[PDB]
From a paper:
The Rubisco from the Antarctic-dwelling methanogenic archaeon [name] likely acts as part of the AMP/ADP-recycling pathway by scavenging the RuBP by-product. MbR contains a unique 26–30-amino acid insertion between α6 and β7 at the bottom of the βα-barrel, and deleting this “bonus” sequence yields enzymes that are catalytically competent, albeit with altered kinetic properties, and are incapable of assembling into (L2)5 enzymes.
The MbR asymmetric unit contains five LSus. Applying the crystallographic symmetry results in the L10 biological unit consistent with previous biochemical observations. The MbR structure (half of the biological unit) contains 10 Mg2+ ions, 5 Cl− ions, and 294 water molecules. As expected, Mg2+ binds to the active site (5 per half-L10 decamer), stabilizing the carbamate formed at the active site lysine. The Mg2+ ion that stabilizes the carbamylated catalytic Lys-193 coordinates to O2, O3, and O6 of 2-CABP upon substrate binding. A second binding site for Mg2+ was also inferred from difference electron density at the interface of the L2 dimers (two Mg2+ per interface and 5 per half-L10 decamer). This Mg2+ ion is coordinated by a structural motif unique to MbR, which adopts a loop-helix-loop conformation. The motif, which forms a separate domain, is encoded by a C-terminal 29-amino acid insertion in MbR (residues 361–389) and corresponds to a β-hairpin motif predicted from sequence data. Although the search model was at the lower size limit for the Dali server, these results suggest that the structure of this motif is unique. Because of its strategic location and its clear functional role (see below), we named it the Rubisco assembly domain (RAD).
Residue numbers in the entry:
A (entry chain B), B (entry chain A): 1 to 473
C (entry chain D): 159 to 316
D (entry chain C): 1 to 158
The structure:
């Protein structure tokens, strides 16, 4: 085994022994959800003892062996099966029979990123990656409406979906809000999203915002001759107010496919996400992630990675989630963290950080799955008539202090154009305002698509020229 | 102003100028939600420029001033009004007109601990404290069912409510679960709670668990002549499953006051917390906080404090919330954090960290508020017939690696007994089992109340003597 | 010619998604009929509601690709009368093309009352009688019981 | 282990080895429905190959190992874990996860006293006893009305 490992194993209590199995036959057999954590002990206990306590507390156990313990309960124990003592990593196998039925995501998180995060026996504890076996992946929903469905509605292919966020973040009225929408759309933009805290403030009655946005869209659609989309912030105080807001939009007379529902998944919760997925499965569910920084940032030893968050959004059924600008914009931080996460939600097969994931439902050795993976890499729309085989894609939403000049840099690190980009400041701060602001973004996209440098395309494209002058000088 | 504070103000952009008012006349006038963050800038920006940036992003702004901005929108800018450069603290005033109506708590959190946690222009960002003006508090629910109401039902006063959590955390069946309930209650325990991830697993049908607990309670109540409570985990995949589980308990048909509803508030979400408060206002709402460590853990420089979590739980209407053992048990970590938070939710008037909080609704100078406060400090039940005057009590739940030998030490740090304590491993791991574990916990409470040393009290109480032997070895 | 069919194997262990792949593979390779292995039902890892759904999708594709109509015989055996009709009604509203589904009942373990309930409630669906446990009655080594002739004749009468 | 049992183990094919564990560490752990059959083989096959074949057909297996088999399906395999060769008895452990949910009894009997009764490879196959772990009993109804309730209506006692 190794002298060190045999000694670490001899150091375990009768309690700890039950949450360790460094000779686990097949972790990828289907019985388990696999997890890897960055872990650092917080004194008294050694690495294997601390890993055995973390496993106990995220599964069936507690601080001391209890008299109420059964033999059947021991079969549900999570078990430490692998360790990297240099990189300080811990591999724990979680029996997915531990999880609450009916496809509950908050329950998985209650175990693997719950109570364990507050244990004084750890100094750092970051959940880095997880593996969902086909047997478990089948118990959850997964996305029912995707970016492919949106693209079919918009008729927008082989480029990113060009979006904006209505800015100011707060303070505009329901009339002023709709003007910002109209101007972005009519200027050539595709998608408008509500800034995350914009809801029913006394000066912007939700009922009026919805009616004006519907009128504004109708105008932009007739003038441009092109379909447009609005992602509405549907987060509320409670279940009933959210549904009241969903139904306001649902009954406003929008053309099906032209409206999406945004939810602040971290603050509103994973229950509001699943509710929306299940109640409105033919509407694009946009997961905004405000407050994830406590979990995901480099500076924080305790929490979870952006890959984990992104993977759980796809499992829960989010049509899209914000994955970051790989540090090109205003938020932290890198292509290593952000593009790995985007690829885990975009593709059928991905590396990603520690566990390679194929989002099938059936075995990845079946010729038909191998085909789907190949077809996926060729940029063909899959799972239209064979949904049972795999979980559908969850779209990256790239936002955070971007502008037309930061587009080509982001696509280069991304290695593809199957994402939604949203630029607030980068559009509404433009010298000529939102319409010119939108044209600059459109122009920078056309430049990229026809292999040109923006400075060369800008020679006969005023809005992009002004943007380059403004966003650099 | 001062030499350095002058230079810092001269360094601000026309945009950053808009989110700074160091000469704010009256921050406590009632227009603002006051907040204080611990903050360190992350290169390129100075303290005031970073603070102006945070303020913009947590109210009405973005990284560049926008053409779409209005004079009316500027009225709602959050303002940096005070600093402590040595202690690295910044005070920001948030107009509560920013916040969504209908008493939406997730929307507050979306601004003040949302996107700003992810900004690369900070190294640390920890929200330490908040101040709710009487005007704002009236727009929120606050608790409707309190520990005063549960103590009335139970007929338990002048001591903590002594409870347990059913252990194993997972693996027991619905019938095995009900035996652990009965044994604790019949041994002298008041309160039984579902361990946070306990729900509808395949081997513990929720419907059977509920029915056996109904029967188990009746047997225990009848044998002890003493009323008992059960806190059920109603956290589910979605809204509709949660109400179905709540409604299953509602018709079980327990005696009113004998059941509470538990919600994994962080993972389930604030919308779930609010839904239960508004839907079941005459049921004790129990806020379990699994996953809070990402935000509240000292090792993490980005997030928010335990005081803040606890204060927003009372605002949303939890009848109780977990506050910690002040580092006496297995979680992190101190009286400075844990007792301050408890006191904020227990009492009408509190210090707490940076803002003194009187939870009135009306002006803290009315002689009637002064009386409520004097009466509260005397441990007299308030707000039975004058609820309009102030927001009600939110109960500290003290859990995490405690045993009867750690009961006194916590009370000494707490400075009172108005709380619920749950001991899972400290009861079920008793060498005599759950019934002896409960007897040991009851005996330790009596020893504390009587002012007797446990080692002395245990000379004529075997279950306590056994606990002292076991838990100190 | 004979109707060429399969039984989804393994007998137990596949999920509802995996089950439907086996169905698709058989029908697309030229097979006509797929039946549930007799003890395949609503086990925790193969939700019956999901199985019916994926089988409806799997079939549609196999019919489109082969240009040939296909059939699935669904194990409708349950704990009781009410659960059995719940399963039947799930299939009845899934919504398959009439003729493309049959109902399978373990007539010895479930009973002759389950066999007659399905005949009378669903007269326009093929009633597939599976005889698991008949060996105690029919087996030549057993002196007491009844013949395969008797069992088969009574099933025709029912 | 014993030379008689060692050669009996060595006779097992790849498929049969999957449904045998004579070293099952805890058959009463709660995961299994324990069974004991009085069995005699049907010629060609020995005691343990016949047992491993019965175990196969009573759980997840079939005559020949299949391409469609998954690692997750092998976890629900019934395992032969004890033998009394003189008494002609074989003990099989059945994962209760195999059985149809909602406390369906018809289904338990379709596995443990179904198709296996008609198999060529046995002369005798009598299920003598079974053992229900507490985890399993809680998934089933059990009686609601009893003779203690009848005796109270009747006032008939002792
Ligand atoms: O509020 C903002 O800052 C944004 O609207 C972007 O506005 P700008 O386009 O004006 O920067 C987004 O909410 C953030 O991108 C969220 O971060 P992430 O996508 O990283 O979750
Ligand atoms: O699962 C647990 O660990 C507990 O049930 C305690 O059990 P023990 O009594 O066996 O430790 C609680 O959920 C934690 O105390 C929560 O932490 P906090 O109270 O800090 O939110
Ligand atoms: Cl080991
Ligand atoms: Cl100033
Ligand atoms: Cl063996
Ligand atoms: Mg925003
Ligand atoms: Mg295939
Ligand atoms: Mg717990
Ligand atoms: Mg007065
Ligand atoms: Mg069969």
């Amino acid at each position: 085994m190794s002298l060190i490992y045999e000694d670490l194993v001899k150091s375990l209590d009768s309690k700890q022994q039950a949450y360790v199995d460094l000779k686990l036959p097949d972790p990828t057999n289907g019985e388990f959800l696999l997890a890897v954590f960055h872990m650092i002990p917080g004194g008294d206990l050694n690495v294997l003892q601390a890993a055995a306590e973390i496993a106990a507390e995220s599964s069936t156990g507690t601080n001391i062996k209890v008299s109420t313990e059964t033999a059947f309960s021991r079969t549900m124990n999570a078990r430490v099966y692998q360790l990297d003592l240099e990189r300080e990593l811990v591999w724990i196998a979680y029996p997915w029979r531990l999880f609450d039925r009916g496809g509950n995501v908050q329950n998985i998180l209650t175990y693997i990123i719950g109570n364990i995060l507050g244990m004084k026996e750890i100094q750092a504890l970051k959940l880095m990656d997880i593996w969902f076996p086909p047997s478990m992946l089948e118990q959850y929903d997964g996305p029912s409406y995707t970016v492919d469905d949106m693209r079919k509605y918009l008729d927008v292919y082989d480029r990113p979906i060009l979006g904006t966020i209505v800015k100011p973040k707060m303070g505009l009225t329901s009339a002023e809000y709709a003007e910002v929408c109209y101007d972005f759309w009519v200027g050539g933009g595709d998608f408008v999203k509500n800034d995350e805290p914009q809801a029913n403030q006394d000066f912007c009655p939700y009922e009026k915002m919805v009616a004006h946005v519907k009128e504004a869209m109708d105008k932009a659609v007739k003038e441009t001759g092109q379909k447009k989309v609005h992602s509405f912030n549907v987060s509320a105080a409670d279940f009933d107010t959210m549904i009241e807001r969903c139904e306001m939009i649902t009954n406003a007379g929008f053309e099906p496919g032209s409206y999406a529902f945004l939810i602040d998944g971290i603050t509103a919760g994973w229950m509001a996400v699943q509710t929306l997925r299940r109640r409105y499965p033919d509407v694009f569910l946009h997961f905004h992630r405000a407050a994830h920084g406590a979990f995901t940032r480099q500076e924080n030893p305790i929490g979870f990675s952006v890959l984990v968050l992104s993977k759980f959004a796809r499992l829960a059924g989010a049509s899209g989630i914000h994955t970051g600008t790989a540090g090109i914009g205003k938020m932290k931080g890198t292509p290593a963290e952000d593009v790995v996460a985007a690829h885990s939600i975009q593709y059928l097969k991905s590396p990603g950080h520690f566990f390679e994931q194929t989002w099938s439902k059936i075995m990845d050795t079946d010729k038909d799955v191998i085909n789907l993976v190949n077809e996926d890499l060729a940029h063909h729309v899959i799972l239209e008539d064979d949904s049972w085989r795999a979980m559908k894609k969850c779209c990256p939403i790239v936002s955070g202090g971007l502008n037309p000049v930061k587009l080509k840099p982001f696509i280069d690190v991304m290695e593809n154009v199957d994402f939604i980009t949203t630029m607030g400041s980068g559009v509404h701060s433009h010298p000529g305002g939102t319409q010119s602001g939108a044209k600059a973004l459109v122009q920078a996209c056309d430049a990229y698509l026809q292999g040109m440098d923006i400075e060369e395309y800008a020679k006969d494209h005023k809005e992009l020229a002004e943007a380059i002058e403004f966003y650099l000088n």
